[PDB]
Amino acid sequence: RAKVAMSHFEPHEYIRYDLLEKNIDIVRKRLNRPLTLSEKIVYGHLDDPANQEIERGKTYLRLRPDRVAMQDATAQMAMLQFISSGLPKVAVPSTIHCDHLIEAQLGGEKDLRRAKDINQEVYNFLATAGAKYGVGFWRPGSGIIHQIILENYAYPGVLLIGTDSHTPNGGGLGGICIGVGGADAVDVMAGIPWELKCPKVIGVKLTGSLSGWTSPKDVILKVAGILTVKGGTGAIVEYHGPGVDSISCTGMATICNMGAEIGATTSVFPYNHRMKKYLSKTGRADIANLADEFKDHLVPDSGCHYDQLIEINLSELKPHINGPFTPDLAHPVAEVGSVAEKEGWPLDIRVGLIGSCTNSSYEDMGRSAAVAKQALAHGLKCKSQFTITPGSEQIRATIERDGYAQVLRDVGGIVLANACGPCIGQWDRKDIKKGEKNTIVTSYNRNFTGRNDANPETHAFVTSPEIVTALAIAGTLKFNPETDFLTGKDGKKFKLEAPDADELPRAEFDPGQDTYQHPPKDSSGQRVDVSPTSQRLQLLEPFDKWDGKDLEDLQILIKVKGKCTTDHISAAGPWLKFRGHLDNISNNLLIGAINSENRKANSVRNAVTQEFGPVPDTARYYKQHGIRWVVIGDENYGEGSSREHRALEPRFLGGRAIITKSFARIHETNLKKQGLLPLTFADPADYNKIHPVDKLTIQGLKDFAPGKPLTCIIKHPNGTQETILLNHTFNETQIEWFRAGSALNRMKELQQK
Numbered sequence: 001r002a003k004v005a006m007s008h009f010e011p012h013e014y015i016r017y018d019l020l021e022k023n024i025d026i027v028r029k030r031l032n033r034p035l036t037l038s039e040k041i042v043y044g045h046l047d048d049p050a051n052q053e054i055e056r057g058k059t060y061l062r063l064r065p066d067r068v069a070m071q072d073a074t075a076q077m078a079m080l081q082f083i084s085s086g087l088p089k090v091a092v093p094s095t096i097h098c099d100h101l102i103e104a105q106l107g108g109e110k111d112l113r114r115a116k117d118i119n120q121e122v123y124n125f126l127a128t129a130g131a132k133y134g135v136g137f138w139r140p141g142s143g144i145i146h147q148i149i150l151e152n153y154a155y156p157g158v159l160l161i162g163t164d165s166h167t168p169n170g171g172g173l174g175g176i177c178i179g180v181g182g183a184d185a186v187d188v189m190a191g192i193p194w195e196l197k198c199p200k201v202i203g204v205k206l207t208g209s210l211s212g213w214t215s216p217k218d219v220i221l222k223v224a225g226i227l228t229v230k231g232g233t234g235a236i237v238e239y240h241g242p243g244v245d246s247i248s249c250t251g252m253a254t255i256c257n258m259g260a261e262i263g264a265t266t267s268v269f270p271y272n273h274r275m276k277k278y279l280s281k282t283g284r285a286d287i288a289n290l291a292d293e294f295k296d297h298l299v300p301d302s303g304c305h306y307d308q309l310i311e312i313n314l315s316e317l318k319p320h321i322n323g324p325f326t327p328d329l330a331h332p333v334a335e336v337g338s339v340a341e342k343e344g345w346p347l348d349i350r351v352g353l354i355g356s357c358t359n360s361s362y363e364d365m366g367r368s369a370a371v372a373k374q375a376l377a378h379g380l381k382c383k384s385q386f387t388i389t390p391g392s393e394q395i396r397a398t399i400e401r402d403g404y405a406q407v408l409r410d411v412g413g414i415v416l417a418n419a420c421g422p423c424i425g426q427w428d429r430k431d432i433k434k435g436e437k438n439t440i441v442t443s444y445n446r447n448f449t450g451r452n453d454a455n456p457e458t459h460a461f462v463t464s465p466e467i468v469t470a471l472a473i474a475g476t477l478k479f480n481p482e483t484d485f486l487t488g489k490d491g492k493k494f495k496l497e498a499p500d501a502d503e504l505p506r507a508e509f510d511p512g513q514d515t516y517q518h519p520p521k522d523s524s525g526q527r528v529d530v531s532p533t534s535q536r537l538q539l540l541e542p543f544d545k546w547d548g549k550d551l552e553d554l555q556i557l558i559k560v561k562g563k564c565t566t567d568h569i570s571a572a573g574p575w576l577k578f579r580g581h582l583d584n585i586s587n588n589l590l591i592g593a594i595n596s597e598n599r600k601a602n603s604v605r606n607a608v609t610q611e612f613g614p615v616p617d618t619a620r621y622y623k624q625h626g627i628r629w630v631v632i633g634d635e636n637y638g639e640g641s642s643r644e645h646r647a648l649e650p651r652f653l654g655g656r657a658i659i660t661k662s663f664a665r666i667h668e669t670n671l672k673k674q675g676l677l678p679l680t681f682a683d684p685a686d687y688n689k690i691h692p693v694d695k696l697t698i699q700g701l702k703d704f705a706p707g708k709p710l711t712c713i714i715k716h717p718n719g720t721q722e723t724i725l726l727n728h729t730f731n732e733t734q735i736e737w738f739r740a741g742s743a744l745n746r747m748k749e750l751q752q753k
């Protein structure tokens with residue numbers, strides 16, 4: 001066909017639209033119905049399109065992703081498990097991005113230099129394992145994973161998996177980009193088919209066009225409010241309609257990115273002329289030309305069916321700000337000042353933070369600079385503290401060159417290193433004490449309790465970068481940039497004009513400094529060294545195989561009440577230090593979950609000693625004494641970030657099963673991967689039949705089968721027993737993971753020994 005390379009760093013790996021077309025055509029001859037865009041890309045990547053059972057919401061698809069991307073907080077454990085597989089080289093184009101371990105303290109260069117010294121052991125390990133297994137390495141300072149992927153690796157029609165739940169960002173360039181745990185990335189790096197439950201498809205038809213203060217962020221702040229955080233579970237969100245040509249390519253990436261907050265499998269936009277324009281300005285005009293020739297396969301079929309349709313008229317949409325402790329609590333900016341007042345949310349904004357991969361594009365920085373130049377023209381500067389995170393080195397070098405960084409510095413902003421920083425709590429925040437109630441507004445995406453600064457009483461609101469800038473200048477939520485007046489230096493009242501700015505640089509992007517490290521694909525004789533006394537890295541010891549018996553008289557470690565995110569199960573911030581060390585990071589296990597017994601965090605009753613104490617310590621006491629335990633959870637258990645540490649930590653400390661009303665997708669997959677039993681109540685009311693003191697027996701593991709429920713005997717202290725039924729979503733492939741003790745153990749059994 002054409003021999004067009006997948007990226008500038010892999011000149012030999014060609015885009016296979018011929019394969020994609022061939023597979024779409026085998027499948028549509030079988031289904032004889034129009035296919036949505038996500039169906040064309042996903043089914044076009046099936047391992048076996050002639051025989052695969054295809055039913056939305058029901059069958060597991062065996063897929064062949066084109067590439068794997070990892071960020072350094074999840075890459076360490078993905079690579080420790082790849083190292084246990086014993087396999088010599090990764091099977092597909094794979095990259096590591098070092099963006100999660102650079103703490104914000106002093107700003108830019110200073111924080112990067114400190115991070116490189118503090119994290120040397122870990123950056124060393126990743127660069128060395130990268131050179132040895134043939135994984136490309138983007139050095140600390142290079143940029144945030146999703147911005148480097150949009151700029152270099154995402155293209156129309158790619159199926160990409162990343163060990164990070166905001167991998168959907170890549171949907172802004174017409175690709176299917178899906179968040180997974182590190183063990184799923186090991187399947188694909190090992191060359192074995194990746195499995196994904198066939199998604200439902202929610203269509204969102206966009207009408208009209210954006211005007212004035214409304215930006216692409218408002219489309220997904222509005223959708224999250226409509227769908228709620230559990231509304232997109234098990235579905236891909238597919239944006240379509242005449243209003244799509246009104247959104248820049250980075251804007252589409254913004255909207256696809258935050259679809260992670262409604263639990264969606266991923267989001268996607270159809271190939272159009274805004275993507276073509278972005279591909280040509282990022283050195284990939286040959287890929288835009290090839291996608292023009294396969295354009296029919298990169299847009300939805302006429303008359304395709306969506307399982308749910310939502311319509312949004314971009315011309316009526318007005319600025320939104322969401323939170324404070326969930327991303328789906330939506331408010332127009334115009335009314336948040338009055339709702340805050342009512343609910344007792346601090347009206348004064350201590351810190352305004354722009355950037356992160358969600359909103360650090362050249363157009364986002366240009367629009368924020370446009371608001372900032374107006375304030376400057378009246379002698380004002382920010383009343384709140386103000387920080388700016390560039391998404392990549394190329395964006396930092398280009399906004400520096402075109403003068404936007406200096407405008408943002410002149411209004412009082414501090415430019416932070418090109419890294420997650422305050423977005424996952426890597427922020428040395430000193431202006432408030434812990435427990436001090438305060439408000440910060442961000443252009444980020446998640447705004448859950450204690451995530452930006454480990455203070456549970458910080459009220460974080462997510463909005464667009466131009467609104468964070470307007471509100472940072474005002475210093476209060478009780479300011480609506482569309483209506484209200486500011487007072488300059490000179491005494492005159494003035495109103496902020498709506499920001500206008502170029503979406504892409506008129507000149508080319510300035511690539512900034514050299515940050516990519518290609519693997520020697522020659523040499524590769526590296527020795528990965530993990531010191532046996534390291535506190536940051538530890539090689540894995542395999543988990544135990546199943547004993548062949550039912551699980552009797554299980555102790556409940558904790559029955560959790562309400563929301564239980566993976567930041568409640570395995571907190572980030574300070575614990576990022578131990579992401580490559582399973583025993584040390586297991587000391588945060590479930591310390592944020594609320595115990596229904598006393599409604600406290602990290603305070604559970606030890607059944608033997610009858611002392612209330614920390615959840616980690618109690619689980620290690622049960623493990624030490626041979627007591628197998630269970631977690632009982634509520635709805636959407638495991639919501640959030642993809643970190644497989646939330647599944648590895650309960651396995652390591654002696655847990656056996658997690659029984660909930662429902663699971664978020666990535667966490668449920670991660671639990672199955674590590675040999676635990678994620679089970680749901682066949683009747684959710686049965687959550688109330690189980691009390692912390694009850695013991696449980698799960699029966700029927702001997703004839704464990706797809707679609708057959710498991711029986712659970714609740715043993716009450718007084719001698720009463722109640723039998724209830726538990727559903728599970730295991731197919732046969734996955735029951736083999738459970739019988740072997742984990743998916744990695746099963747893979748190593750298939751290597752003939």
Ligand SMILES: O=C(O)C[C@@](O)(C[N+](=O)[O-])C(=O)O
Pocket residue numbers: 073074100163164165166420424572640641642643
């Ligand atoms: O797992 C991590 O490293 C944290 C993270 O960036 C990742 N994520 O999976 O969403 C987040 O947003 O919580």
Ligand code: SF4
Pocket residue numbers: 144145146164166356357358419420423424445
């Ligand atoms: S922590 Fe924030 S900036 Fe980093 S990859 Fe996740 S969403 Fe993006």
